[PDB]
Ligand binder design. Structure first.
Ligand SMILES: OC[C@H]1O[C@@H](O)[C@H](O)[C@@H](O)[C@@H]1O
Ligand SMILES: OC[C@H]1O[C@@H](O)[C@H](O)[C@@H](O)[C@@H]1O
Ligand SMILES: OC[C@H]1O[C@@H](O)[C@H](O)[C@@H](O)[C@@H]1O
Ligand SMILES: OC[C@H]1O[C@@H](O)[C@H](O)[C@@H](O)[C@@H]1O
Ligand SMILES: OC[C@H]1O[C@@H](O)[C@H](O)[C@@H](O)[C@@H]1O
Ligand SMILES: *[C@H]1O[C@H](CO)[C@H](O)[C@H](O)[C@H]1O
Ligand SMILES: *[C@H]1O[C@H](CO)[C@H](O)[C@H](O)[C@H]1O
Ligand SMILES: *[C@H]1O[C@H](CO)[C@H](O)[C@H](O)[C@H]1O
Ligand SMILES: *[C@H]1O[C@H](CO)[C@H](O)[C@H](O)[C@H]1O
Ligand SMILES: *[C@H]1O[C@H](CO)[C@H](O)[C@H](O)[C@H]1O
Ligand SMILES: *[C@H]1O[C@H](CO)[C@H](O)[C@H](O)[C@H]1O
Ligand SMILES: [Cl-]
Ligand SMILES: [Cl-]
Ligand SMILES: [Cl-]
Ligand SMILES: [Cl-]
Ligand SMILES: [Cl-]
Ligand SMILES: [Cl-]
Ligand SMILES: [Cl-]
Ligand SMILES: [Cl-]
Ligand SMILES: [Cl-]
Ligand SMILES: [Cl-]
Ligand SMILES: [Cl-]
Ligand SMILES: [Cl-]
Ligand SMILES: [Cl-]
Ligand SMILES: [Cl-]
Ligand SMILES: [Cl-]
Ligand SMILES: [Cl-]
Ligand SMILES: [Cl-]
Ligand SMILES: [Cl-]
Ligand SMILES: [Cl-]
Ligand SMILES: [Cl-]
Lengths: 65, 65, 65, 65, 65, 65, 65, 65, 65
């Protein structure tokens, strides 16, 4: 186990393919920049802006299943 | 006693969507900071500030179902 | 994923059986108390005193295996 | 790969066993808090304060082979 | 470990042979240009245009397997 | 050209010790931020601000021997 | 080794025009005085003090071309 | 070859004909007075003040071909 | 014209073939090491030990021709 925290300082511009996304998570509140991280099936991890529509829709899609 | 207990040391500013939350709990009073943790349908866990209005509203909504 | 942190507030009195320990970790520096956590074969987390000899020996055993 | 960055927001107080440490690294400059992360043989990861003598000594020990 | 980031400034013209791709990832959101990087079996990183059909199909192939 | 190139988007404030640096290089002029990367004996890589006095002193020392 | 190497034993105070410089190099570390030599388009060669701010500004500019 | 250095201790006031100049050079930093030497086709050599505009313009003209 | 000075830090071991030598000169008194430089027909500069008999004979040959 690790004491480090994953933070984001920038976001991807174009929406990654929804079908590739395995899960998501909100970055810690200690992070200076609020962000969402999408995790793909092969464990690519992409920082996303929670203020974006497609990001919110993706999260909504993941939770409601 | 000797079991770990979850503590929060910060809160994200942006409120997570009410419809995603399935339950909540208070962190132990032994923690340095008072906190509420919202658990989502997919078991994402977010620390929240109990002194915030929207947090209170969420808890009320969760309790009054 | 969760942004809560496993913190300890008490140390186990009786040394755990070594053959039950599958792994260990140090609690975050965010926690007010320094602590070692052992994870058992049954995935239970047990806080232990970092200064105790058996604790240091278990850790050294786990790392040097 | 991932575009999240490991950040530290607190430091361990007690020096961890030098012999357990496999490597170290400096956290990114994006991180609000400057830190050093020690990585053990079994990949425990511990945040450390680079302004501490034992931390600097450990780093010196690691890089000088 | 390094705090530099792999960024792209040009996209390969000829589609890479699929059988040589062993991994992909998206460049950080910090990079000025959006890009897809394919990692070859010879461990070389190749920038590709995210909009190109063969690029999206390669990614989709890599994630769904 | 289709190869990725290292870019820096921040610098740690605390100068790493001169003695563990074995080499340096400038990031591509295509990067949004001008930067120097110091490579340690154990191949840690740290982004540095070329406009800083200590960075230039280090480079001079590395190149004058 | 038996070949001569250029050394500098002083520096002109007034910085030469940046636009005139096409390249630069460090004198050998064997030279008693550390120095940078700027080479103009018409191949004039001027000794410069590497500890000067404008000199490192020039070098940085020449590198992030 | 010679280890004497050409130095200037005064400057011409009247600008010499640009078309007569085939080259220029900065006097060494060893010289007490910073200066520019213009060399004519028939190898007349004139000391000039680099702080004067016409001198700078002449140099700029020579370097930029 | 250049502000740098040709200095030597090593003496050639095998005496140059006399017929290859075009001219000679003494390195500046500014150089930390005394030396003789022979200029070859191919316009290369070779540092030589000023104490060696063959060096002094070559110089004597060149001056008394
Ligand atoms: O990864 C989430 C949590 O991990 C802990 O190790 C860190 O100390 C916390 O600050 C963080 O919120
Ligand atoms: O790739 C690793 C990370 O290094 C950090 O320094 C950067 O802020 C990130 O943008 C980058 O993704
Ligand atoms: O002008 C080209 C210059 O390149 C440098 O690397 C050499 O040390 C100089 O001797 C040479 O004059
Ligand atoms: O590593 C950067 C290199 O850039 C070249 O242009 C310089 O002449 C070298 O002195 C330098 O080492
Ligand atoms: O230092 C001795 C002198 O020798 C001459 O050849 C150089 O042009 C001067 O710059 C130098 O100062
Ligand atoms: C790492 O340690 C345990 C798992 O061993 C737990 O998930 C903690 O939350 C994490 O920091
Ligand atoms: C969420 O949990 C930890 C951090 O909380 C880590 O990044 C995991 O990869 C992710 O699933
Ligand atoms: C992860 O992706 C590649 C490796 O595949 C690279 O090392 C980057 O540094 C990281 O983002
Ligand atoms: C250093 O590289 C990345 C971050 O730069 C990651 O945390 C690795 O685990 C570490 O060794
Ligand atoms: C004179 O000697 C050689 C030419 O033979 C060289 O140019 C030196 O720089 C100069 O002092
Ligand atoms: C510049 O080179 C030497 C001195 O550096 C000499 O004066 C020449 O005449 C000039 O062209
Ligand atoms: Cl965005
Ligand atoms: Cl899914
Ligand atoms: Cl609900
Ligand atoms: Cl409020
Ligand atoms: Cl606590
Ligand atoms: Cl004991
Ligand atoms: Cl500390
Ligand atoms: Cl080691
Ligand atoms: Cl941060
Ligand atoms: Cl150190
Ligand atoms: Cl960039
Ligand atoms: Cl393209
Ligand atoms: Cl296409
Ligand atoms: Cl070194
Ligand atoms: Cl230029
Ligand atoms: Cl620059
Ligand atoms: Cl004048
Ligand atoms: Cl001309
Ligand atoms: Cl010298
Ligand atoms: Cl001899």
């Amino acid at each position: 186990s690790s004491d480090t925290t994953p933070c984001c300082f920038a976001y991807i511009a174009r929406p990654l393919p929804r079908a590739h996304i395995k899960e998501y998570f909100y970055t810690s509140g200690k992070c200076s920049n609020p962000a969402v991280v999408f995790v793909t099936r092969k464990n690519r991890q992409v920082c996303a802006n929670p203020e974006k529509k497609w990001v919110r829709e993706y999260i909504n899609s993941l939770e409601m299943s």
